[PDB]
Amino acid sequence: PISPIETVPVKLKPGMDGPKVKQWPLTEEKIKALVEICTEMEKEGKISKIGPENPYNTPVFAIKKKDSTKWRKLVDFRELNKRTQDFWEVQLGIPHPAGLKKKKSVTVLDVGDAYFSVPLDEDFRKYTAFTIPSINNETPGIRYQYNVLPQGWKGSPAIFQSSMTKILEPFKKQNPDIVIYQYMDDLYVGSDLEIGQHRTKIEELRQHLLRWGLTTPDKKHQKEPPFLWMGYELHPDKWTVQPIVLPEKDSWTVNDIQKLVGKLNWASQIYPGIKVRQLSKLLRGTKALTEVIPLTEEAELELAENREILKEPVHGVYYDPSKDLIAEIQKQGQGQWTYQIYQEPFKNLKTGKYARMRGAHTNDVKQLTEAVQKITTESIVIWGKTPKFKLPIQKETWETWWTEYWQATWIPEWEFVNTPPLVKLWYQLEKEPIVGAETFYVDGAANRETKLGKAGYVTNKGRQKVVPLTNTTNQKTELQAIYLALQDSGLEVNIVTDSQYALGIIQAQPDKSESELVNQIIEQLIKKEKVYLAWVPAHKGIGGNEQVDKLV
Amino acid sequence: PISPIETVPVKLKPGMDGPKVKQWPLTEEKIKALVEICTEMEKEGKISKIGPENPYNTPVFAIKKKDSTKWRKLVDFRELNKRTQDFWEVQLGIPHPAGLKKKKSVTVLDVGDAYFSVPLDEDFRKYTAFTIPSINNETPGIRYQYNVLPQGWKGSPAIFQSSMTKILEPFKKQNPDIVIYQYMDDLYVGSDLEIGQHRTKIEELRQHLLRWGLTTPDKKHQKEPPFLWMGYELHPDKWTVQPIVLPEKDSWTVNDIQKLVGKLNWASQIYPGIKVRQLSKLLRGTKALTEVIPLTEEAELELAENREILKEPVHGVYYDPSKDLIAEIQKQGQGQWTYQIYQEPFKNLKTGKYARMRGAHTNDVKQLTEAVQKITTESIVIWGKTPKFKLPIQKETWETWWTEYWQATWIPEWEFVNTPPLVKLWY
Ligand SMILES: N#Cc1ccc(NC(=S)NC(=N)Cc2c(Cl)cccc2Cl)cc1
Ligand SMILES: [Mg+2]
């Protein structure tokens, strides 16, 4: 029954008073079906009768969707919860298993209908008033008020788990070795004392709990390693995800391609190298809940490899507080980078992927960091410390970039790994102009409307050229020019662009891009011996850039 | 402590609800720290534990003020502030001496310790609720609410005002000319004395607050110098301008001129009085990049006069207490980090720069974290209020490290920006 427990004082949102909703005089069958339920409740102390003087009312329902033994009364609190102060959302933070610690004997007790014994502020009970009717205008209605935590109320999962935690505290300070955790209706208790030695404590736990009204049945209870929690499969030493099945069709619609892509990330927690770029590059569209989205060529190949992977099941090891964490990043190539966190080489703690979903131009070194980063942040959350990295890159390749990269980054210590692909600056531009090297006064304007442009140059050597372009933006040409110059020039060249766009790009030294031209202007940089780029503002800077700006 | 006070009623702005900012995840080093610090405060009745009826929640980190003597709690009340201290920026608003930025020297000692005596208004507590995380959230955070004006919260000071000015009078007498700015947790004493003398005024002051109630851990060293004996002494005299170095080496090429025509053509917003056409006419031809060119007519002069308006600071630049102070810092080169503190683009207020050591901790995310705490104080001191920084750093990287080298009792506001382009080579 109820408890001696201290009652958390609750208040309804400012000004707002209690709900006053009515019951739609329903099946007089169900009626006496609540009248019996209610009466077993008022006796258990769970509720009480009250002089209709100043109460409100919430809709009272009786049901049993089911195909079983009895009926359940279900009070709809919607319009009460719309008036109750907010509480401290604590399930807001979920413990990720990959940072849990081995544990011998784990048990879980069913508390589900325990909140029914946790008192309810003896002053916020008037608002739990509900009216169970009578045969038909037979009685004003059998009228009760809730004395504990209504099964719907907003402040319940909260106030309960508060109250709970409190209750357990002492029991948790006289067994500082064992550990208790809760989950809505699931209290799990895991420890080290051999299941037997474990049983006693759980019974003592149960005995402690009963010493406070909180009751706890053992029948049709739970202990079922694997434990299905938060969409995980929890064993006393290993851990993994819910059964992940990848539906297969010949017709795909966002509604399914999403459930597909998402479900594909969730598996990444422990499944090595899972990719998702190509597959969700499709759902990369407008709000079509049922638009017929036809898998493209990559989507297929990719979904394929996620199977080859997802097929073979995988396990997850736990964290040993006494052993430094390690983490390695692998580059899958398409801005897709996969990692995995270990303490011991032939089993994992957790694995992961990181892809540069960002804008239009990036870098394998830059990305390697973002990944190095994405990871660090995760560790701190899970394990409470940063991991020792092992990354596909050389101190010399790194230190160069950060030393020449306007943004300020910081990578914890890191041990090199020759595991190709090898992250490395595919090229560098001259800091100073090459002496003697032909200068290409370059440019290429386009018509915003005519979507027609020109891109050429003019060298000191007096060499000119102006290739025509149809179906082009302006930035498209300001890069054609460049590529164009690079194209008709010696292993050594000095390029002059009026295009800060083209420059701000090139200067970042992208090793790849989402553009058909920036990936070409790239492989021409990769080939040159000495390349120095220069910036002269368009108009005003019509210095040498003059002759170049005229032709086009 | 042991002698109750008439708490000062505190009203959050109408329509404004307490803060509900989420607790950044900490190292376990940082938890154990705070976990201890708190239990302590709890015994002292300083602050207590709450329940689920308090849904409010403000951030808490842990850093080291001394060196590593031992940890210190630092609640990021940056929020409860906007929702309080902003309206408690006047109700009990502490004024700012626009001369402090001039003393021969400004020592800086804190008092955050003082507040910890004045009981906090029973009704307001709930909003100062702060919560110690756990590693992996394997447990419900420990929840605490303050029962005294906590520290970082910009209203503990305003409430304590009265009391300070009272402890600080029997010293304002003695030493007139000394200026005392109390901004949040720390006092800013500034005097035009030969170091040693001022230094005395300070110690002479500290000893004052001290024999009255306040305590200042300001014991900087302890009769011992091994090449590191720092007690916050700023020198708002050298707070100065002009390092926009136009090359000079009398041998300019098509390339050397090129870059120039640009940086000059850049400052056309911050300085609309600079021409370049005549020097850009020098480029007018499509000559090689490593060829030398010749000084022309007005150009040769244009380099003079356009290097001249480049000495007379931009006029129109007046602090606007209405608007906010923005400060963008930019990675310059090894060790050096140029910066600016404007209120409206291209109307810069102060444009210093900075540097740190290579071997010894050669790190960006450290320098920056200092170039902030420094850039900041220029402000607290100059305009009496921390800026908002356009930090050239990945939101998440910074998110992770700052706490480290972070010495200060305050957290400014900040944001992270994509790429300074043609600005690292200028200022
Ligand atoms: N099955 C299982 C299982 C696996 C790992 C752990 N290890 C730890 S350190 N977790 C706990 N202390 C408690 C715990 C959590 Cl976090 C989640 C569900 C149940 C329990 Cl009991 C506990 C139980
Ligand atoms: Mg042009």
Provide the residue range defining the domain that includes B281.
Answer: 234-319
Query: A90, A96, A100, A189: which to mutate for ligand 1, most atoms within 8 A of CB?
Result: A100
Residue A86 with chain B: CB contacts under 8 Å: 55
Give the angle subtended at the CA of B244 by the CAs of B243 and B248, to the nearest 5°: 105
Tell me whether residue B1 is in a domain. no
Q: Report residue B20: phi and psi, to 5°.
A: -145, 60
Question: Could you tell me the CA-to-CA distances from B151 to B23, B81, B112, B114, B146 in Å, in that order?
Answer: 18, 11, 6, 9, 10
Q: What is the CATH number of the domain that holds A494?
A: 3.30.420.10
Q: For residues A322 and A307, is the Cβ–Cβ distance under 8 A?
A: no
Closest CA to B156 of B406, B410, B417: B410
Closest atom of ligand 1 relative to the A239 alpha carbon: 4
Q: What is the CATH number of the domain that holds B382?
A: 3.30.70.270
Pairing of strands A142-146, A130-132: antiparallel
Q: What is the dihedral of CA A460, A466, A472, A475, to 10 degrees?
A: 10
- On whether both A310 and A198 belong to a single domain, the answer is no
* Total number of domains in chain A: 5
Q: Would you state the structure tokens that stand for residue B299, as one six-digit string?
A: 């150009």
Within 214-253 of B, beta carbons closer than 8 Å to A belong to 253
Terminal C-alpha separation, chain A: 88
Any binding-site annotation on A121? no
Closest CA to B57 of B21, B85, B82, B26: B21
Q: Say whether B280 and A543 touch across the interface (CB within 8 A).
A: yes
Residues 6+ apart with CB under 8 A from B253: A433, B289, B290, B291, B292, B293
Peptide bond into A247 cis (omega under 30): no
Nearest-ligand number for the alpha carbon of A546: 2
Q: Would you state the structure tokens that stand for residue B10, as one six-digit string?
A: 């505190």
- On whether both B93 and B105 belong to a single domain, the answer is no
- On whether both B30 and B154 belong to a single domain, the answer is yes
Question: Could you tell me the CA-to-CA distances from B95 to A127, B106, B113, B158, B205 in Å, in that order?
Answer: 49, 17, 21, 10, 21
- On whether both B140 and B17 belong to a single domain, the answer is yes
Quick one: three-class SS letters along A139-187?
Answer: CCCEEEEECECCCCCCCCHHHHHHHHHHHHHHHHHCCCCCEEEEECCEE
- On whether both B104 and B218 belong to a single domain, the answer is yes
Q: For residues A134 and A31, is the Cβ–Cβ distance under 8 A?
A: yes
Q: What is the CATH number of the domain that holds B153?
A: 3.10.10.10
Residue A103 with chain B: CB contacts under 8 Å: none
Tell me whether residue B345 is in a domain. yes
Strand arrangement, sheet containing A492-497? A464-470, A452-459, A439-443, A492-497, A530-535
Question: Could you tell me the CA-to-CA distances from B336 to A42, A341, A518, B124, B357 in Å, in that order?
Answer: 75, 36, 32, 45, 10
Between B27, B254, B397, which is nearest A409 by CB? B397
Q: For residues A445 and A552, is the Cβ–Cβ distance under 8 A?
A: yes
Between A86, A458, A541, which is nearest B280 by CB? A541
Question: How far apart, in whole angstroms, are the C-alpha atoms of residue B93 and residue B101?
Answer: 20
Q: For residues A263 and A272, is the Cβ–Cβ distance under 8 A?
A: no
- On whether both B106 and B242 belong to a single domain, the answer is no
Quick one: three-class SS letters along B222-247?
Answer: CCCCCCCCCCCEECCCCCCCCCCCCC
Residue finishing a domain among A124, A156, A188: A156
Question: How far apart, in whole angstroms, are the C-alpha atoms of residue A104 and residue A235?
Answer: 10
Q: Compute, in angstroms, the gap from residue A184 CA to the centroid of ligand 1.
A: 15
Q: At what angle do helices A297-311 and A254-266 cross, to 10 degrees?
A: 40
Question: How far apart, in whole angstroms, are the C-alpha atoms of residue A93 and residue B134?
Answer: 10
Q: Compute, in angstroms, the gap from residue B368 CA to the centroid of ligand 1.
A: 40
Question: How far apart, in whole angstroms, are the C-alpha atoms of residue B188 and residue B192?
Answer: 14
- On whether both A337 and A450 belong to a single domain, the answer is no
Q: What is the dihedral of CA B164, B167, B170, B171, to 10 degrees?
A: -60
Q: Say whether B331 and A408 touch across the interface (CB within 8 A).
A: yes
Question: Could you tell me the CA-to-CA distances from B226 to A105, B219, B229, B230, B233 in Å, in that order?
Answer: 55, 16, 7, 11, 18
Tell me whether residue B3 is in a domain. no
Q: Report residue B264: phi and psi, to 5°.
A: -75, -45
- On whether both B24 and B152 belong to a single domain, the answer is yes
Q: Say whether A95 and B363 touch across the interface (CB within 8 A).
A: no
Which residue pairs from A125-128 have beta carbons closer than 8 angstroms and sit at least 24 positions apart in sequence?
Answer: A125/A48, A126/A18, A126/A50, A126/A54, A126/A55, A126/A56, A127/A12, A127/A18, A127/A19, A127/A56, A127/A58, A127/A80, A127/A83, A128/A47, A128/A58, A128/A75, A128/A80, A128/A153
Query: A101, A105, A180, A181: which to mutate for ligand 1, most atoms within 8 A of CB?
Result: A181
Question: Is some CB atom of chain B closer than 8 A to the CB atom of A382?
Answer: yes
Strand arrangement, sheet containing B142-146? B47-49, B142-146, B130-132
Residue finishing a domain among B319, B348, B370: B319
Provide the residue range defining the domain that includes A512.
Answer: 427-552
Q: What is the CATH number of the domain that holds A148?
A: 3.10.10.10
Longest C-alpha distance within chain A, in Å?
107
Between A162, A408, A547, which is nearest B365 by CB? A408
DSSP designation for A480: H
Ligand 1, CB within 6 Å, residue ranges: A 95, 100-101, 103, 106, 179, 181, 188, 190, 225, 227, 229, 234-236; B 138
DSSP designation for B47: E
Three-state DSSP class for residue B196: helix
Q: For residues A354 and A337, is the Cβ–Cβ distance under 8 A?
A: yes
Residue finishing a domain among A167, A191, A225: A225
Three-state DSSP class for residue B195: helix
- On whether both A126 and A173 belong to a single domain, the answer is no
Strand arrangement, sheet containing A142-146? A47-49, A142-146, A130-132
- On whether both A44 and A120 belong to a single domain, the answer is yes
Residue A178 with chain B: CB contacts under 8 Å: none
Nearest-ligand number for the alpha carbon of A552: 2
| B167 burial type by CB count under 10 A (0-12 exposed, 13-18 middle, 19+ buried) | middle
Q: Residue A530 is inside which H or E element, if any?
A: strand A530-535
- On whether both A340 and A252 belong to a single domain, the answer is no
Q: Report residue B211: phi and psi, to 5°.
A: -80, 5
Q: What is the CATH number of the domain that holds A196?
A: 3.30.70.270
Closest CA to A116 of A163, A65, A182, A59: A163
Nearest-ligand number for the alpha carbon of A93: 1
Q: Say whether A88 and B55 touch across the interface (CB within 8 A).
A: yes
Residues 6+ apart with CB under 8 A from A128: A47, A58, A75, A80, A120, A145, A146, A150, A153
* Residue A351 bridge partners (DSSP): A340
B273: Cα within 13 Å, side-chain hemisphere:
12
Q: At what angle do helices B156-167 and B195-212 cross, to 10 degrees?
A: 100
- On whether both A8 and A75 belong to a single domain, the answer is yes
Q: Residue A390 is inside which H or E element, if any?
A: strand A388-391
Question: Is some CB atom of chain A closer than 8 A to the CB atom of B26?
Answer: yes
- On whether both A63 and A15 belong to a single domain, the answer is yes
Q: Say whether B31 and A547 touch across the interface (CB within 8 A).
A: no
Q: How many CB atoms are located within 10 Å of the residue A211 CB?
A: 12
Within 385-414 of A, beta carbons closer than 8 Å to B belong to 385-386, 402-403, 405-410
Within 338-397 of B, beta carbons closer than 8 Å to A belong to 363-368, 392-394, 396-397
Query: A107, A164, A188, A240: which to mutate for ligand 1, most atoms within 8 A of CB?
Result: A188
Closest atom of ligand 1 relative to the A189 alpha carbon: 21
Q: For residues A495 and A480, is the Cβ–Cβ distance under 8 A?
A: no
| B261 burial type by CB count under 10 A (0-12 exposed, 13-18 middle, 19+ buried) | buried
Question: How far apart, in whole angstroms, are the C-alpha atoms of residue B179 and residue B187?
Answer: 10
| A544 burial type by CB count under 10 A (0-12 exposed, 13-18 middle, 19+ buried) | buried
Q: For residues B302 and B279, is the Cβ–Cβ distance under 8 A?
A: yes
- On whether both B159 and B169 belong to a single domain, the answer is no
- On whether both B15 and B144 belong to a single domain, the answer is yes
- On whether both A298 and A392 belong to a single domain, the answer is no
- On whether both A9 and A58 belong to a single domain, the answer is yes
- On whether both B110 and B202 belong to a single domain, the answer is yes
Residue finishing a domain among A139, A156, A173: A156
What would the DSSP string read from start to end of B112-131? TTTTTTSB--TTTGGGG-EE
Q: Compute, in angstroms, the gap from residue A538 CA to the centroid of ligand 2.
A: 4
Q: Would you state the structure tokens that stand for residue A194, as one six-digit string?
A: 């051999």
Q: How many CB atoms are located within 10 Å of the residue B223 CB?
A: 4
- On whether both B104 and B136 belong to a single domain, the answer is no
Three-state DSSP class for residue A395: helix
Q: Where are the beta strands (DSSP E) in B290-405?
A: 326-331, 337-340, 388-391
Residue A382 with chain B: CB contacts under 8 Å: 135-136
Three-state DSSP class for residue A441: strand
Strand arrangement, sheet containing B179-183? B179-183, B186-191, B105-110, B233-234
- On whether both B103 and B56 belong to a single domain, the answer is no
Residue A95 with chain B: CB contacts under 8 Å: 136-138
Question: How far apart, in whole angstroms, are the C-alpha atoms of residue A200 and residue A218?
Answer: 13
Q: What is the dihedral of CA B151, B157, B163, B168, to 10 degrees?
A: 100
Question: How far apart, in whole angstroms, are the C-alpha atoms of residue A98 and residue A445?
Answer: 55
Residue finishing a domain among B289, B304, B319: B319
* Total number of domains in chain B: 4
Closest CA to B251 of B303, B295, B283: B295
- On whether both A176 and A275 belong to a single domain, the answer is no
What is the experimental method?
X-ray
Question: Is some CB atom of chain B closer than 8 A to the CB atom of A369?
Answer: yes
- On whether both B75 and B137 belong to a single domain, the answer is yes
Q: Say whether B290 and A435 touch across the interface (CB within 8 A).
A: yes
- On whether both A101 and A218 belong to a single domain, the answer is yes
Breaks in chain A (C to N > 2.5 A) come right after none
Tell me whether residue B4 is in a domain. no
Question: How far apart, in whole angstroms, are the C-alpha atoms of residue B129 and residue A375?
Answer: 30
Q: For residues A67 and A51, is the Cβ–Cβ distance under 8 A?
A: no
Q: Compute, in angstroms, the gap from residue A545 CA to the centroid of ligand 2.
A: 7
- On whether both A18 and A145 belong to a single domain, the answer is yes
Question: How far apart, in whole angstroms, are the C-alpha atoms of residue B167 and residue B212?
Answer: 7
Q: Would you state the structure tokens that stand for residue A528, as one six-digit string?
A: 């040159």
Closest CA to B421 of B331, B337, B347: B331
Type of residue found at B202: I
